[PDB]
Design a protein around this nucleic acid. Sequence first.
RNA 1: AUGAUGUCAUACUUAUCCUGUCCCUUUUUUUUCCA
Lengths: 119, 67, 133, 130, 792, 28, 122
Amino acid sequence: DDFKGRSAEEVEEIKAEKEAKTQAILLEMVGDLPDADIKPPENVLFVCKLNPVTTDEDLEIIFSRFGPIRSCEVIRDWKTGESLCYAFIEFEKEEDCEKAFFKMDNVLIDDRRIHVDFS
Amino acid sequence: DHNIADYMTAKNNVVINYKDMNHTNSYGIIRGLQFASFIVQYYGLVMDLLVLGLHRASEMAGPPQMP
Amino acid sequence: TAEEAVAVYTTTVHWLESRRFSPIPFPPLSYKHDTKLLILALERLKEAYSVKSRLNQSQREELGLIEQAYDNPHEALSRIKRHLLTQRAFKEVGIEFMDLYSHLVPVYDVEPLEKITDAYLDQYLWYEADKRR
Amino acid sequence: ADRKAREAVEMRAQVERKMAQKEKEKHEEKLREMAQKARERRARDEIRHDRRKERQHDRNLSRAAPDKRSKLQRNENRDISEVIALGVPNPRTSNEVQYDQRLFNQSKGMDSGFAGGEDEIYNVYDQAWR
Amino acid sequence: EDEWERTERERLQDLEERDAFAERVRQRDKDRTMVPELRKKSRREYLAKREREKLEDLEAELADEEFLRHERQELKYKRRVRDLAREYRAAGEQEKLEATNRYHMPKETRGQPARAVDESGAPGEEQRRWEEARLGAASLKFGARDAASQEPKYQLVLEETQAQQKESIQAVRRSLPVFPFREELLAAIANHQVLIIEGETGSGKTTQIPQYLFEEGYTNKGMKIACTQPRRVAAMSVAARVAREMGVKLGNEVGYSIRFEDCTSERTVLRYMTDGMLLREFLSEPDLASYSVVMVDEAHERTLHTDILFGLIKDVARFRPELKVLVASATMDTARFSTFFDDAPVFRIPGRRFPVDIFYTKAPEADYLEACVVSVLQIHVTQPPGDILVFLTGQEEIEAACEMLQDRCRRLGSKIRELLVLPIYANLPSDMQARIFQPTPPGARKVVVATNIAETSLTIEGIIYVLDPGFCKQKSYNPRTGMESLTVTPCSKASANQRAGRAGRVAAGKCFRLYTAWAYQHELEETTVPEIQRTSLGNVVLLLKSLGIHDLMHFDFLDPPPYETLLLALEQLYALGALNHLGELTTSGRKMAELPVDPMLSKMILASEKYSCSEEILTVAAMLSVNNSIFYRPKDKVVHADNARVNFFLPGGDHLVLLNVYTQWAESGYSSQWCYENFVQFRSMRRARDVREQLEGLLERVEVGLSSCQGDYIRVRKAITAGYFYHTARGYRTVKQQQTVFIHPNSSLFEQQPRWLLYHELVLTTKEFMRQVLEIESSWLLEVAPHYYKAK
Amino acid sequence: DLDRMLREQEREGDPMANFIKKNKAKEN
Amino acid sequence: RLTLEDLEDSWDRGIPRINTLFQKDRHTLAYDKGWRVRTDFKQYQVLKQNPFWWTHQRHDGKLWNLNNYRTDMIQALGGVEGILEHTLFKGTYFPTWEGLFWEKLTNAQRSGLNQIPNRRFT
RNA sequence: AUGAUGUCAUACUUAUCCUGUCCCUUUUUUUUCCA
């Protein structure tokens, strides 16, 4: 049967899900993400839009006010070690990671409004 | 487009004059129009579909990708 | 009657659906081939007055309109598209007859501005129908 | 009739689209099996990795700074053919047919040689007599 | 002028301090400026962006690997998987395409119709398209297509070293005429640091001399060797030839840096750039510590920026103890360059030449367009090998020469074979230019009629017979009248000598002089006037003042520019908002000199944010920054090209027309087919796009935001009038210089003569013309520059 | 135009050229 | 490339008439569609009747050449001297026939017969 | 009771006058991204 008769926003979110499904299928075709469902591990926060003079321990101490983080790792340069202003913070709980990521945007850390998302 | 077809139809509904006679052409087509040949061949296409039927005309024209 | 016209309309709709026909749009504001179609229509209209005879007032008026459209094609194309968009009532047409001594042939006489507009419409419609098959 | 025809055409189009959509999905499934053939396939390398890292940094710079994407977009393949001919030693192929220019413009004119009817205008011969 | 370099260096550190203060102001302004649903949104954006980024980068990495057993297997796997992804996206696009191609009978729409989504291959395919139409009308075949059955089909019985390529590359490199002279050349390099090198072209000096310096090991500590060029395309050719001599890809140790194209990946030993580049790192770096040896292009172009580079290199040779700088040359007029560089040594290199015996006409004539055609035909009836080049001095007579030669060639049939005629312009689309570089047919005696592109820039093979009428156009500017004339003049003797050098490049030349040898010996000048005397210097007076030089009238040069040109340039910069009461550059003058276009055009940017609408006048300045002419006016056609020009017309001058051209080129895919269908050159307006991109990138350094009005074209014309107050004229007469004016026929306001108007340029060719006019009312004319404007 | 005529006769119907083409097809 | 000698033999052959491929105005002639019907409905518009309603010299090409007819008619009438014996050529006292060459106002009538060319023919 | 004001047309004057216009070359910097 045809799928017609739903709402317009329902058609929009179904088409967006189809676009994301075809993107995930194409990434499975290429082999950059050879897993099927393609799911990142939780309690991991990706931090970007910052300055390269930040510290991992100071970022963990700042993030521990809204939930404790198990570890942190800044994605620096593979040849020179210069900071690429991107990092992954591995938390202990997913709710602590969500509470840390819900109160981290638009905060001038090292004179830069860093953004926190998933990885 | 509907504006084009409205011009096509309204061009044929004019007044024919000769000396002291005037009459409004409301039924026939006027062959003196510059675009009258297109209307004649399109109406003849409709009559070809009436004569041949749809199946034999589609067989004669072939598929639309390879006419 | 009623059902004959409905059957004709339905058969035409089914035939155009079967051929995957794309409908002819309006002539756009910046068409690629509008000047070439205007040149072809003006040559087609200038075909009949190549004898350079004594003519009359109406033929000289038509030839002057052809030359005015030839000098300024953009204003002529704008006037043609304005006539296609707006006007639905037209001037009267003259009729006469050619005696071919076995039968008579009707000859119609049209105002030259409408002749220019109809010639451009004929060229555009035949080019679009040939391109869209 | 117009309204009825509209609905009929629309519903027919939907049905056709649905079956074509199914065919596309079938092809995707078949090529997903070909992806497992990629799993049957992959079951100056450091210089290439450094070039890939430099290209990724250039792509991130072009994402951060809105401009043309280095030589891949500003030069690209649609460059000016002068620097393709001179500054690049790699040329490209050419289509169409070359002709002599001397065979090219013997006849001119917009219209046919019969000016409507125009019976009394001589012109029964093409060239002059002598 | 060591104190000049110290002052220049000090101005560079205070420019860095002003840049740091403006940067600190920029971050001051910047700082002063559900959970699974958010996870699904983040994953949707992340996999969409990463999928399109990896799909973009993968074929770029495959192309980089192609330019550079297990690796072959990995490359085969990568090629197969990118082909698989490409056909997967093609299948999805095919599904959307068959969803598009339906009947869909039209809805009755109230109001005016709207243009929907449209195409095919437009440039050059209409000829083969109409050939296919004639073939379809001509081919006749009966019966069904299936007719291969009942065929017995009888058959005929019949009867029962890659290292050698590199060694050939060094053999070709050792076949140069500089190869016996290289040891004495490096000895003279070790002797003096200011050595001038002369030699006629074809010797391969500019490719082998930095090469022989590279095996001399002058770049050992990381100080790279630099070679400048007068034009970008010749720099591309020289860098490509050196890179193919070395087998090393560009961006590496053989690399280039020109405008919008810097292929240097920080490993570049042999850096090839233009003179504007070397002025730009003079404007950034005070001393060439990163450059060991600078190779200088030939001075026979007499380019303005090369003369500025000559003055700065003389200042460096005063300042630095050594740089081993060296200047190339063509002819024997190196005594002035030697005496300019403190009795510099001159080293001559012979080149491969041929007898290019100059013929003569024993009559003075002033026609040179029928006699040149008769000369072409009389060359075509004598000796069969060779190609013919004819020099001319403008577009409008060389198209008439092409038409006359084509009409004379079509008048003969089997008599007189081939003779294909190809013209050269600067405002020619690149397909007709690239048709020249194709080899000639074996039955042809290919004629390339040309302007001075083949004399100066382009090198074309196979030419033997060369005509020369001895006329070229000069862009002469008169500062006493404030008027610039492009007028045809007789040439120079050195120009005729380089024309004869271009004549017999491959074989024995037969250069036909088109006037008397007495006028060549006596009436003809022997020296070409350089650029700085002919033209105004309003662009580069600000460049010299931005580099700390205050003695502009006492600056070192090969020859001094006239004082009236400097007086009018300083008076204009007084009228512009860049000079103080003491003739000193302001911080607004630093904003004037940041972005590199002309200051009279760069007052658009300082007029922006005073009337908003910054992006519109940015694109207006992008079309006013072009070199070649916009719009295509071909031989014949005319009416379609004129209608395509009229279709872009807007009230208020042609600046809004050019803005409309860039606006309609936007939201069109930036396609070449749109520019071909609208008679717009797709060589000159891509340059306008690149200029607009560079000026958009150079907007934080001037600190001007991306502002727009979307309808307030009165604000756009007010910002233009704020930028253009000096260039006004009304009353069929200049309002200041009292010189009569005439409207150009190619302008959008040739008819409907205005009440008040400004302009951009005042080129005199036949009448005193009117280039790039714009409608004003002289109401906001008094609102800007009140010192210049008084009493209506 | 004798040379162009011999060129046209070498580009004519020419069963010899068909023999040459089929011999190069069968040999290679 | 395709040379002049490739198509010099087949220049005036073919029903679409090969030389029509190399007309000057062929690019704007590529957009002319449906012109046979324009002639066959131009009989309803133009008063005079066209005998060449079925062809077009730019599209179809010049389908006939009658240049040999004049030469053979001059030969069949007895040559140029045999023709000129019938005329008043000897009365004109011209030395030879090879140099021979022929030829906004209001008016009461203009549809009358022009008697001057009939007088010079007589 | 006759003054100003508007491209609206029609008369009128000067022994007014039958008329002309499309550029050679070309050069000008710097900074981030996911198992």
